[PDB]
Amino acid sequence: LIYTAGGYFRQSLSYLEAYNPSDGTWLRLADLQVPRSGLAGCVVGGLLYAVGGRNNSPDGNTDSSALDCYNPMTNQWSPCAPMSVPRNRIGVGVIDGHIYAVGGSHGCIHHNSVERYEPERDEWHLVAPMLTRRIGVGVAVLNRLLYAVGGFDGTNRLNSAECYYPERNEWRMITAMNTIRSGAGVCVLHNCIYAAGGYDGQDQLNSVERYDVATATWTFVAPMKHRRSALGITVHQGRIYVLGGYDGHTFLDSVECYDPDTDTWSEVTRMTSGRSGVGVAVTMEPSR
């Protein structure tokens, strides 16, 4: 199952919905404890983690440092220890069962900080900061290395990408993308880092480009059918899924799937309601 948590459409949502690519169905599950947009989702030990984001309530607007975990066996949410700072429009990646929270904003502060979460101790430790302040950053893990791609620094939208070495504890710059992208969807498929969509300060983008480590190069692939930024992205059974996003006029509910063997995109499903800024991950389906 593909899970989408949170999101945004006129305000921040607490929806938690799971998609079945063979059923067609969307499952409504336990709402997030607090409505949140601009968050990230990941899966460690089967549990679905929802990280950071912001609560845009009609009453107030607060960036979040919260970490919350969802259990598909219990269909229940449980809070974890929070990060050191609120991180809206965050990126996250998993390395050896540890959650890396990357960038994001807190009010006017644009983070370059990065922190690591250890699920076995429910603890958060700060690691080496990034070379760039990046909110709306895409994050991926390839061969146990953490990559931070694109983003916005508060003044400029970025096309650069950097790599973090966990044991070396430092970041080093890599080849920049062909396109400046903030709020793109970044994932790993096979051994290539995919950057899809995003916003370049002027247009929402449908272009997709993938980074090959062996040649240290970003090459363009088949573009999506719909430009979108602040989209959700995940990989399921060797195919990429992008969910939602914002195209400058509407909050999309389109869900596109990319088949790498044919370099093509297809529209498989719509979400129950358009939204952007979701967390998205894949884990076992819940329990009847």
UniProtKB/Swiss-Prot annotation:
Chain positions found as S-(2-succinyl)cysteine: S287
Outcome reported for the amino acid change (mutating H110A): Loss of interaction with NFE2L2/NRF2. Abolishes repression of NFE2L2/NRF2-dependent gene expression. Does not affect interaction with SQSTM1/p62
Consequence recorded when altering N56A: Loss of interaction with NFE2L2/NRF2. Strongly reduces repression of NFE2L2/NRF2-dependent gene expression. Impaired interaction with SQSTM1/p62
Modification after translation (UniProt): Non-enzymatic covalent modifications of reactive cysteines by electrophile metabolites inactivate the BCR(KEAP1) complex. Accumulation of fumarate promotes the formation of cysteine S-succination (S-(2-succinyl)cysteine), leading to inactivate the BCR(KEAP1) complex and promote NFE2L2/NRF2 nuclear accumulation and activation. Nitric oxide-dependent 8-Nitro-cGMP formation promotes cysteine guanylation (S-cGMP-cysteine), leading to NFE2L2/NRF2 nuclear accumulation and activation. Degraded via a proteasomal-independent process during selective autophagy: interaction with phosphorylated SQSTM1/p62 sequesters KEAP1 in inclusion bodies, leading to its degradation.
Kelch repeat copies, ranges: 1-46, 47-97, 98-144, 145-191, 192-238, 239-285
Tissue: Broadly expressed, with highest levels in skeletal muscle.
Outcome when changing F152A: Abolishes repression of NFE2L2/NRF2-dependent gene expression
Effect of substituting Y199A: Loss of interaction with NFE2L2/NRF2. Strongly reduces repression of NFE2L2/NRF2-dependent gene expression. Abolishes interaction with SQSTM1/p62
Positions marked as site (Sensor for electrophilic agents): C108
Impact upon substituting G104C: In a lung adenocarcinoma patient; somatic mutation; strongly reduces interaction with NFE2L2/NRF2 and reduces repression of NFE2L2/NRF2-dependent gene expression
Modification S-cGMP-cysteine occurs at: C108
Purpose of the protein: Substrate-specific adapter of a BCR (BTB-CUL3-RBX1) E3 ubiquitin ligase complex that regulates the response to oxidative stress by targeting NFE2L2/NRF2 for ubiquitination. KEAP1 acts as a key sensor of oxidative and electrophilic stress: in normal conditions, the BCR(KEAP1) complex mediates ubiquitination and degradation of NFE2L2/NRF2, a transcription factor regulating expression of many cytoprotective genes.
Domain notes: KEAP1 contains reactive cysteine residues that act as sensors for endogenously produced and exogenously encountered small molecules, which react with sulfhydryl groups and modify the cysteine sensors, leading to impair ability of the BCR(KEAP1) complex to ubiquitinate target proteins.
Subunit comment: Component of the BCR(KEAP1) E3 ubiquitin ligase complex, at least composed of 2 molecules of CUL3, 2 molecules of KEAP1, and RBX1. Interacts with NFE2L2/NRF2; the interaction is direct. Forms a ternary complex with NFE2L2/NRF2 and PGAM5. Interacts with (phosphorylated) SQSTM1/p62; the interaction is direct and inactivates the BCR(KEAP1) complex by sequestering it in inclusion bodies, promoting its degradation. Interacts with NFE2L1. Interacts with BPTF and PTMA. Interacts with MAP1LC3B. Interacts indirectly with ENC1. Interacts with SESN1 and SESN2. Interacts with HSP90AA1 and HSP90AB1.
Similarity section: Belongs to the KEAP1 family.
Protein name listed in UniProt: Kelch-like ECH-associated protein 1
Annotated organism of origin: Homo sapiens (Human)
Shown residues in whole-protein numbering: 327 to 614 of 624
